[PDB]
Design a protein around this ligand. Structure first.
Ligand SMILES: CC(C)(Cc1c[nH]c2ccccc12)NC[C@H](O)COc1ccccc1C#N
Ligand SMILES: CCCCCCCCCC(=O)N(CCO)C[C@@H](O)[C@@H](O)[C@@H](O)[C@@H](O)CO
Length: 282
């Protein structure tokens, strides 16, 4: 049994270290590629940078802390770090779906109203948009957690709050529903609605302007596939606590984490990223 534990720890630790490396390496490349290639320095890629930072924070902070919990079965970092960790987790997935939502609107307005778009949409303004996305994401994610709005009345929950080794996100039903709707479900619907409109307006309307759009359609689709299972379960868990097994919930949350390693791979469809990747890996 002690050998089974010693194998499981060292085994998992490496899988986790591989995941961390794939996320951090992949996204640092994307930030560097854009940051040092003036062919890639478009307004749209400013939003891709923002998105890569969100995925970077997942790789440097969210998954590391999450790994120590999955390896060692308990939280080792004190109740304050548990809260700050959870806040960063919630923050990143919120900022990601909001930025993807901006990207869809960006592409739409650029397609349907190209004269008015290109005369209004500036670098200064894309930065303002990006900050506003992060400001809103911070507001919706950080505050309710620090205010303990998520916490429930149950004695078993109360037991977990006092124990600085418990870092389970046992949330009340109101928070579970509200935070899911505000952080995920609303921006997801807006994104899908706008993305379908773009897909329609693309056919009605030029190889390089397209294909890049398809790429953006992929990242949005993949994100949805990685996160929808988690948020669906999260809502089901409110109506009946026992239907979904613990492992399936934890697994789906890890699928969502995994999404942070996927974009840099998907960007390799764009040859200019591919060339910038090859140059940087000197
Ligand atoms: C914080 C938690 C539950 C990870 C976690 C932390 N401790 C746990 C113990 C057992 C299972 C999972 C966990 N997962 C957060 C997910 O990344 C998604 O988080 C969210 C993002 C926006 C709105 C609501 C949620 C939630 N819940
Ligand atoms: C955006 C999140 C907003 C969530 C809204 C918080 C609702 C208040 C919490 C609540 O109703 N209970 C927990 C007691 O605090 C009672 C169970």
């Amino acid at each position: 049994a002690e050998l089974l534990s010693q194998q499981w720890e060292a085994g998992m630790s490496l899988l986790m270290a591989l995941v961390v490396l794939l996320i951090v390496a992949g996204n640092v490349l994307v930030i560097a590629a854009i940051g040092s290639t003036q062919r890639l320095q478009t307004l749209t890629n400013l939003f891709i940078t923002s998105l890569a930072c969100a995925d970077l924070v997942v790789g440097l902070l969210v998954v590391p802390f999450g790994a120590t919990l999955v390896v060692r079965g308990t939280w080792l970092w004190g109740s304050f770090l548990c809260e700050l960790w959870t806040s960063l987790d919630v923050l990143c997935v919120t900022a990601s779906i909001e930025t993807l939502c901006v990207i869809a609107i960006d592409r739409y307005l650029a397609i349907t109203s190209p004269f008015r778009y290109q005369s209004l949409m500036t670098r200064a303004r894309a930065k303002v948009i990006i900050c506003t996305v992060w400001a809103i994401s911070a507001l919706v994610s950080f505050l309710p957690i620090m205010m303990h709005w998520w916490r429930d009345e149950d004695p078993q929950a109360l037991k977990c709050y006092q124990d600085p080794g418990c870092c389970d996100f046992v949330t009340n039903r109101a928070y579970a529903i509200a935070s899911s709707i505000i952080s995920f479900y609303i921006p997801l619907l807006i994104m899908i609605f706008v993305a379908l409109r773009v897909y329609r307006e693309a056919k009605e309307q030029l190889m390089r302007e397209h294909k890049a759009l398809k790429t953006l359609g992929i990242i949005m689709g993949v994100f949805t596939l990685c996160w929808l299972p988690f948020f669906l379960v999260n809502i089901v868990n409110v109506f009946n606590r026992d239907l979904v097994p613990d492992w399936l919930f934890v697994a789906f949350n890890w699928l969502g984490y995994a999404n942070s390693a996927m974009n840099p791979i998907i960007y390799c469809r764009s040859p200019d990223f591919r060339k910038a990747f090859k140059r940087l890996l000197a």
